[PDB]
Amino acid sequence: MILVTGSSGQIGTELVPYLAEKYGKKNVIASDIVQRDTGGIKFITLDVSNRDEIDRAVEKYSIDAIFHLAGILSAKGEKDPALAYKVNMNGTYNILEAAKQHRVEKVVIPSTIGVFGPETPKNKVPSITITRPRTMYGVTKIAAELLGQYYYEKFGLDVRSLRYPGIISYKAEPTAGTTDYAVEIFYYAVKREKYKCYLAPNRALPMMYMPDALKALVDLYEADRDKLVLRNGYNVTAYTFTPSELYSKIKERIPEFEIEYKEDFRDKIAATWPESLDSSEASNEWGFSIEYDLDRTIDDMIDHISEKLGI
Amino acid sequence: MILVTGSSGQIGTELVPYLAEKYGKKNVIASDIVQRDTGGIKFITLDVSNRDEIDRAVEKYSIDAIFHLAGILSAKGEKDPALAYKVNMNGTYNILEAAKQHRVEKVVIPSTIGVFGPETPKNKVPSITITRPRTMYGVTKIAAELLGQYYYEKFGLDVRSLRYPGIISYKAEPTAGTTDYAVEIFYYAVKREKYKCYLAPNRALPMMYMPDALKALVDLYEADRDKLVLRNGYNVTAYTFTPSELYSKIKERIPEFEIEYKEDFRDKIAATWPESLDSSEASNEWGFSIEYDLDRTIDDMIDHISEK
Ligand SMILES: NC(=O)c1ccc[n+]([C@@H]2O[C@H](COP(=O)([O-])OP(=O)(O)OC[C@H]3O[C@@H](n4cnc5c(N)ncnc54)[C@H](O)[C@@H]3O)[C@@H](O)[C@H]2O)c1
Ligand SMILES: NC(=O)c1ccc[n+]([C@@H]2O[C@H](COP(=O)([O-])OP(=O)(O)OC[C@H]3O[C@@H](n4cnc5c(N)ncnc54)[C@H](O)[C@@H]3O)[C@@H](O)[C@H]2O)c1
């Protein structure tokens, strides 16, 4: 039995049916504080900041694995750091301790490039590097990785984690992160409208398409234990680009659309992060691989967003 | 008005009178969940894990600065990680939130070499380095440094911190800490008794004497917030030695001294930390300096422990 927390978000909306198709709708339990249609898959209300709720869910459903997605992202976290701390820090601790106290075999946590800071090298950064995040989100996430590793080394609890770069998708709309523009821009492109970008035109960041993000999280989940040396904090990425570069590439398909740059607080967050990641450890230790390069995700996004908007 | 949490500990026992001496007795307030003699200075019971208590104290005593010493150390943290997380993680968060809410203009947190892990270079480690701690204590402490820097960059709360190595002292009794062997060994030596050390004979670690530890904490506290760039995570040390090295030096003064090694979980903790630290940043930014080398610390300890 697999429990997914924070399943109503950008990733969860697709991870739940992804897990269901692979292991059976019957073996997956979706959960969040906000319910959304999960197409037949069981959904339960679960606030991760409430230890009692986690215990009850794990007990009732004899949970064997937890994909812990629940959390307040980078941007939203800066608007309410107290909320981010409660949900991300105490919530992750609750999940780890609950898993340990019960018979949960594995816990998989999606960390982020948000664990990096100004001192972190900007190009092809490895997994073991300087981690001095400057956002509440980042502090709770590096803490989660360390707590995760500690629960394995101390209690033998199989906790694994990877660091996601910006995730691009079309099924569920991102709203609380810093890399959200990479999705928003497609809507404006397909409608031939002028997109107002909140990141600087040359703000380079690592990114990846949802299909690969889902595959990576599940591949890490299924990875052989004997090769998991790093175990927590695996850098994962597909490509790096700036807003002006993505605009230009989309332009190659849709010439009648434009962009303007009006940077806000999110650009300041992005400035503290690295431009590209080295994902060699993930590939060497559990076979991480990318199937969608930039061109392929751009064309796939245009196709699906165009159908969604009735274009 | 300066508030000190965890004032009854090894550091607090000495920092309080140190503060009263420099800033006046009526300007210091001691606090802890366990009371000890404060030689007149006001003392109040305060559980840092209870946010409401912190708020009342800061409000009632018009606290302007906080030296946050309360916490669970490395060894005890491994014996009870849940307690370490509760008082260290939640406690420090409570202090920061309370400081941010009210009118607190300065908060000083004593971090530790415990924030380092196996990947951290072993020699002359600079402050900006790999920090992947493997103890619950270490996890809570690197989080403390990060939350601190965050509150400063986000809310302007003047939070500063330095990373203490093992601290040697005679005032307070040792508490079986990972580096407390450096204190216990003196009790046994002065009695000419064979000491049973729990760290490996060649387990090198950075250390420093209490007088310098106190001076460093206050020098950091008195620094002009404009001069501080690193601000949090300042590596600080006086010297590096191994148990066999300290034993040898002590034996030069007390030749009948004997020692045997029975390593335990604390040696495994120590093995994950660096051997020596580069403290250039502390010296360049707020003038960090050492006045007690290893010899003076050894002779001074022997003198005091003999007296009791
Ligand atoms: N999307 C990305 O580009 C990206 C990148 C790196 C890391 N991540 C990580 O992936 C996870 C989810 O990402 P996402 O993009 O789907 O986020 P999202 O903002 O789309 O969804 C987050 C979900 O968390 C839920 N939630 C908030 N508080 C909760 C609580 N107390 N209990 C249970 N649920 C709660 C929300 O209701 C929401 O459905 C997070 O841990 C995030 O840090 C995402
Ligand atoms: N002593 C060292 O060598 C050393 C080295 C590096 C960092 N530090 C840091 O210095 C600080 C204190 O060190 P120490 O050696 O004096 O520790 P200590 O163990 O001697 O004292 C800690 C104090 O914390 C108190 N305490 C525990 N829970 C509390 C709570 N909920 N509310 C208030 N007080 C509580 C204890 O009762 C105790 O008096 C800690 O933050 C520690 O991590 C110490």
mmCIF file of C-alpha atoms in Angstrom, chain A residues 83-308:
data_model
loop_
_atom_site.group_PDB
_atom_site.id
_atom_site.type_symbol
_atom_site.label_atom_id
_atom_site.label_comp_id
_atom_site.label_asym_id
_atom_site.label_seq_id
_atom_site.Cartn_x
_atom_site.Cartn_y
_atom_site.Cartn_z
ATOM 1 C CA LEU A 83 3.268 28.282 7.380
ATOM 2 C CA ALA A 84 6.186 26.824 5.428
ATOM 3 C CA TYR A 85 8.012 25.935 8.642
ATOM 4 C CA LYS A 86 5.005 24.227 10.217
ATOM 5 C CA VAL A 87 4.137 22.189 7.132
ATOM 6 C CA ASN A 88 7.607 21.488 5.746
ATOM 7 C CA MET A 89 9.690 21.080 8.908
ATOM 8 C CA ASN A 90 7.256 19.679 11.476
ATOM 9 C CA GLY A 91 5.298 17.906 8.757
ATOM 10 C CA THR A 92 8.312 16.023 7.445
ATOM 11 C CA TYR A 93 9.444 15.154 10.979
ATOM 12 C CA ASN A 94 5.944 13.797 11.674
ATOM 13 C CA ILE A 95 6.052 11.629 8.548
ATOM 14 C CA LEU A 96 9.497 10.261 9.371
ATOM 15 C CA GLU A 97 8.686 9.476 13.002
ATOM 16 C CA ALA A 98 5.302 7.999 12.062
ATOM 17 C CA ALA A 99 6.901 5.813 9.404
ATOM 18 C CA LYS A 100 9.536 4.652 11.896
ATOM 19 C CA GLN A 101 7.025 3.886 14.666
ATOM 20 C CA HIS A 102 4.896 1.847 12.277
ATOM 21 C CA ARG A 103 5.770 -0.757 9.642
ATOM 22 C CA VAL A 104 6.494 1.624 6.775
ATOM 23 C CA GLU A 105 9.287 0.207 4.630
ATOM 24 C CA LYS A 106 10.071 3.238 2.463
ATOM 25 C CA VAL A 107 9.644 7.005 2.442
ATOM 26 C CA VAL A 108 10.489 9.035 -0.663
ATOM 27 C CA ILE A 109 10.918 12.791 -0.429
ATOM 28 C CA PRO A 110 11.092 15.236 -3.333
ATOM 29 C CA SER A 111 13.680 17.805 -2.329
ATOM 30 C CA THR A 112 14.683 20.796 -4.429
ATOM 31 C CA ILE A 113 17.326 23.061 -5.933
ATOM 32 C CA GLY A 114 15.947 25.342 -3.234
ATOM 33 C CA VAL A 115 18.456 23.788 -0.811
ATOM 34 C CA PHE A 116 21.202 25.766 -2.553
ATOM 35 C CA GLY A 117 22.295 29.339 -1.903
ATOM 36 C CA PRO A 118 24.619 32.115 -3.206
ATOM 37 C CA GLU A 119 27.786 30.224 -2.231
ATOM 38 C CA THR A 120 26.740 27.132 -4.187
ATOM 39 C CA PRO A 121 28.639 26.877 -7.503
ATOM 40 C CA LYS A 122 26.512 28.009 -10.460
ATOM 41 C CA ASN A 123 27.447 25.401 -13.073
ATOM 42 C CA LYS A 124 27.007 21.612 -13.060
ATOM 43 C CA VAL A 125 26.770 21.518 -9.277
ATOM 44 C CA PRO A 126 27.265 18.052 -7.752
ATOM 45 C CA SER A 127 25.052 16.611 -5.004
ATOM 46 C CA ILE A 128 27.622 17.051 -2.222
ATOM 47 C CA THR A 129 28.210 20.800 -2.226
ATOM 48 C CA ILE A 130 27.603 23.979 -0.244
ATOM 49 C CA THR A 131 24.015 24.123 1.031
ATOM 50 C CA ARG A 132 23.200 27.494 2.576
ATOM 51 C CA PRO A 133 19.638 28.207 1.361
ATOM 52 C CA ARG A 134 18.251 31.718 1.793
ATOM 53 C CA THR A 135 14.509 30.958 1.706
ATOM 54 C CA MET A 136 12.441 29.412 4.501
ATOM 55 C CA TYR A 137 11.472 26.779 1.929
ATOM 56 C CA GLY A 138 15.118 25.967 1.303
ATOM 57 C CA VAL A 139 15.946 25.704 4.999
ATOM 58 C CA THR A 140 13.082 23.258 5.629
ATOM 59 C CA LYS A 141 14.098 21.182 2.611
ATOM 60 C CA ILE A 142 17.787 20.744 3.415
ATOM 61 C CA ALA A 143 16.616 19.916 6.941
ATOM 62 C CA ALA A 144 14.287 17.284 5.438
ATOM 63 C CA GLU A 145 17.169 15.685 3.536
ATOM 64 C CA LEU A 146 19.327 15.582 6.656
ATOM 65 C CA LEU A 147 16.475 14.271 8.798
ATOM 66 C CA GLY A 148 15.806 11.667 6.136
ATOM 67 C CA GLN A 149 19.410 10.513 6.073
ATOM 68 C CA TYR A 150 19.477 10.476 9.879
ATOM 69 C CA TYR A 151 16.406 8.259 10.107
ATOM 70 C CA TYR A 152 18.156 5.720 7.900
ATOM 71 C CA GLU A 153 21.542 5.835 9.630
ATOM 72 C CA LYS A 154 19.981 5.909 13.114
ATOM 73 C CA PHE A 155 16.853 3.762 12.824
ATOM 74 C CA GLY A 156 17.395 1.854 9.599
ATOM 75 C CA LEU A 157 14.334 3.521 8.020
ATOM 76 C CA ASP A 158 14.634 3.416 4.219
ATOM 77 C CA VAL A 159 14.305 7.108 3.340
ATOM 78 C CA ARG A 160 15.378 8.365 -0.078
ATOM 79 C CA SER A 161 15.261 11.756 -1.727
ATOM 80 C CA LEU A 162 16.158 13.552 -4.920
ATOM 81 C CA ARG A 163 16.355 17.256 -5.703
ATOM 82 C CA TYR A 164 13.941 18.418 -8.353
ATOM 83 C CA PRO A 165 14.768 21.442 -10.551
ATOM 84 C CA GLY A 166 11.860 23.445 -11.968
ATOM 85 C CA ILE A 167 9.112 21.061 -13.143
ATOM 86 C CA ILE A 168 7.164 21.747 -16.364
ATOM 87 C CA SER A 169 3.712 20.199 -16.847
ATOM 88 C CA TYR A 170 0.279 20.754 -18.368
ATOM 89 C CA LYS A 171 -2.141 18.653 -16.290
ATOM 90 C CA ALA A 172 -2.007 20.588 -13.005
ATOM 91 C CA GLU A 173 -1.103 24.280 -12.833
ATOM 92 C CA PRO A 174 1.804 25.392 -10.563
ATOM 93 C CA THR A 175 1.147 28.458 -8.423
ATOM 94 C CA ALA A 176 3.455 28.529 -5.389
ATOM 95 C CA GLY A 177 6.924 28.113 -6.870
ATOM 96 C CA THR A 178 9.632 30.175 -8.545
ATOM 97 C CA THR A 179 9.818 28.224 -11.815
ATOM 98 C CA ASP A 180 6.068 28.558 -12.510
ATOM 99 C CA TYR A 181 6.723 30.881 -15.450
ATOM 100 C CA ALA A 182 7.974 27.927 -17.518
ATOM 101 C CA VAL A 183 4.390 26.656 -17.649
ATOM 102 C CA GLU A 184 2.558 30.006 -17.690
ATOM 103 C CA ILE A 185 4.447 31.156 -20.779
ATOM 104 C CA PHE A 186 2.889 28.386 -22.886
ATOM 105 C CA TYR A 187 -0.644 29.556 -22.152
ATOM 106 C CA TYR A 188 0.211 33.036 -23.379
ATOM 107 C CA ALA A 189 2.079 31.656 -26.381
ATOM 108 C CA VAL A 190 -0.829 29.501 -27.559
ATOM 109 C CA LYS A 191 -3.239 32.426 -27.131
ATOM 110 C CA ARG A 192 -0.823 34.743 -28.941
ATOM 111 C CA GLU A 193 -0.707 37.146 -25.996
ATOM 112 C CA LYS A 194 2.045 39.204 -24.365
ATOM 113 C CA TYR A 195 3.448 37.313 -21.398
ATOM 114 C CA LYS A 196 4.631 39.294 -18.366
ATOM 115 C CA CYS A 197 7.603 37.349 -16.995
ATOM 116 C CA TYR A 198 8.597 37.809 -13.345
ATOM 117 C CA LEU A 199 12.136 36.440 -13.712
ATOM 118 C CA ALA A 200 14.988 38.370 -15.325
ATOM 119 C CA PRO A 201 15.475 37.608 -19.041
ATOM 120 C CA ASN A 202 18.860 35.981 -18.399
ATOM 121 C CA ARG A 203 17.925 34.083 -15.226
ATOM 122 C CA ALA A 204 19.241 30.603 -16.025
ATOM 123 C CA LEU A 205 17.718 27.678 -14.111
ATOM 124 C CA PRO A 206 17.655 23.859 -14.302
ATOM 125 C CA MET A 207 14.348 22.320 -15.403
ATOM 126 C CA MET A 208 12.709 19.055 -16.406
ATOM 127 C CA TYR A 209 9.441 17.780 -17.890
ATOM 128 C CA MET A 210 6.865 16.022 -15.683
ATOM 129 C CA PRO A 211 7.055 12.596 -17.404
ATOM 130 C CA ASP A 212 10.729 12.444 -16.499
ATOM 131 C CA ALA A 213 10.085 13.825 -13.004
ATOM 132 C CA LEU A 214 7.570 11.067 -12.285
ATOM 133 C CA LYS A 215 9.827 8.376 -13.734
ATOM 134 C CA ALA A 216 12.727 9.624 -11.612
ATOM 135 C CA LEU A 217 10.791 9.600 -8.325
ATOM 136 C CA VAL A 218 9.494 6.067 -8.966
ATOM 137 C CA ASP A 219 12.861 4.815 -10.206
ATOM 138 C CA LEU A 220 14.424 6.070 -6.961
ATOM 139 C CA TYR A 221 11.633 4.382 -5.016
ATOM 140 C CA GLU A 222 12.324 1.038 -6.742
ATOM 141 C CA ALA A 223 16.127 1.349 -6.746
ATOM 142 C CA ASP A 224 18.244 -1.531 -5.441
ATOM 143 C CA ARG A 225 19.424 -0.865 -1.885
ATOM 144 C CA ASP A 226 22.995 -2.028 -2.487
ATOM 145 C CA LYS A 227 23.788 0.823 -4.882
ATOM 146 C CA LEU A 228 22.210 3.654 -2.876
ATOM 147 C CA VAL A 229 25.341 5.355 -1.565
ATOM 148 C CA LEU A 230 24.278 9.019 -1.530
ATOM 149 C CA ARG A 231 20.707 7.986 -0.718
ATOM 150 C CA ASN A 232 19.414 11.515 -0.018
ATOM 151 C CA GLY A 233 19.874 14.723 -1.997
ATOM 152 C CA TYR A 234 20.340 13.321 -5.529
ATOM 153 C CA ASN A 235 20.629 16.185 -8.016
ATOM 154 C CA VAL A 236 18.274 15.562 -10.892
ATOM 155 C CA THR A 237 17.834 17.643 -14.077
ATOM 156 C CA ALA A 238 17.065 17.574 -17.807
ATOM 157 C CA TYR A 239 18.222 20.948 -19.116
ATOM 158 C CA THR A 240 18.950 24.579 -18.271
ATOM 159 C CA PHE A 241 17.548 27.726 -19.885
ATOM 160 C CA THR A 242 16.724 31.373 -19.249
ATOM 161 C CA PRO A 243 13.297 32.944 -19.848
ATOM 162 C CA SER A 244 14.505 34.700 -23.008
ATOM 163 C CA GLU A 245 15.792 31.382 -24.363
ATOM 164 C CA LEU A 246 12.521 29.558 -23.705
ATOM 165 C CA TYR A 247 10.651 32.480 -25.260
ATOM 166 C CA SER A 248 12.863 32.285 -28.358
ATOM 167 C CA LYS A 249 12.395 28.531 -28.735
ATOM 168 C CA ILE A 250 8.614 28.754 -28.346
ATOM 169 C CA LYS A 251 8.747 31.595 -30.886
ATOM 170 C CA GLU A 252 10.178 29.134 -33.418
ATOM 171 C CA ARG A 253 6.786 27.420 -33.299
ATOM 172 C CA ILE A 254 4.500 30.386 -32.565
ATOM 173 C CA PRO A 255 5.926 33.624 -34.023
ATOM 174 C CA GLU A 256 2.906 35.808 -33.149
ATOM 175 C CA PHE A 257 3.460 36.129 -29.410
ATOM 176 C CA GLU A 258 5.676 38.283 -27.208
ATOM 177 C CA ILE A 259 7.196 38.805 -23.787
ATOM 178 C CA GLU A 260 8.061 41.592 -21.358
ATOM 179 C CA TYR A 261 10.107 41.382 -18.165
ATOM 180 C CA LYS A 262 8.831 42.773 -14.873
ATOM 181 C CA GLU A 263 10.858 41.047 -12.177
ATOM 182 C CA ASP A 264 9.422 40.563 -8.690
ATOM 183 C CA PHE A 265 10.494 38.884 -5.442
ATOM 184 C CA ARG A 266 10.718 35.506 -7.178
ATOM 185 C CA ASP A 267 13.600 36.705 -9.332
ATOM 186 C CA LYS A 268 15.506 37.443 -6.123
ATOM 187 C CA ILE A 269 14.883 33.872 -4.992
ATOM 188 C CA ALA A 270 16.028 32.501 -8.364
ATOM 189 C CA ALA A 271 19.214 34.592 -8.250
ATOM 190 C CA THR A 272 20.376 32.596 -5.220
ATOM 191 C CA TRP A 273 20.143 29.287 -7.060
ATOM 192 C CA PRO A 274 22.569 27.484 -9.407
ATOM 193 C CA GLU A 275 22.059 27.563 -13.182
ATOM 194 C CA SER A 276 22.694 23.881 -13.937
ATOM 195 C CA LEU A 277 23.094 20.595 -12.073
ATOM 196 C CA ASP A 278 25.304 17.539 -12.475
ATOM 197 C CA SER A 279 23.033 14.493 -12.140
ATOM 198 C CA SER A 280 25.730 11.819 -12.545
ATOM 199 C CA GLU A 281 25.258 10.347 -9.066
ATOM 200 C CA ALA A 282 21.573 9.649 -9.694
ATOM 201 C CA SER A 283 22.398 7.977 -13.003
ATOM 202 C CA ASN A 284 25.264 5.921 -11.574
ATOM 203 C CA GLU A 285 23.483 4.834 -8.402
ATOM 204 C CA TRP A 286 19.939 4.139 -9.600
ATOM 205 C CA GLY A 287 19.851 4.613 -13.374
ATOM 206 C CA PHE A 288 18.290 8.079 -13.583
ATOM 207 C CA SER A 289 17.598 8.976 -17.219
ATOM 208 C CA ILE A 290 15.856 11.634 -19.293
ATOM 209 C CA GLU A 291 13.490 10.877 -22.168
ATOM 210 C CA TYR A 292 12.264 14.397 -22.944
ATOM 211 C CA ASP A 293 14.840 16.949 -24.088
ATOM 212 C CA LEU A 294 13.944 20.637 -24.335
ATOM 213 C CA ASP A 295 12.637 20.486 -27.910
ATOM 214 C CA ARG A 296 10.442 17.490 -27.131
ATOM 215 C CA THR A 297 8.886 19.037 -24.018
ATOM 216 C CA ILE A 298 8.285 22.366 -25.787
ATOM 217 C CA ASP A 299 6.406 20.671 -28.626
ATOM 218 C CA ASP A 300 4.531 18.353 -26.268
ATOM 219 C CA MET A 301 3.501 21.322 -24.088
ATOM 220 C CA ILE A 302 2.293 23.358 -27.071
ATOM 221 C CA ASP A 303 0.270 20.368 -28.287
ATOM 222 C CA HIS A 304 -1.452 19.727 -24.943
ATOM 223 C CA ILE A 305 -1.952 23.348 -23.912
ATOM 224 C CA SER A 306 -3.432 24.082 -27.340
ATOM 225 C CA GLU A 307 -5.960 21.294 -26.885
ATOM 226 C CA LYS A 308 -6.715 22.378 -23.315
#
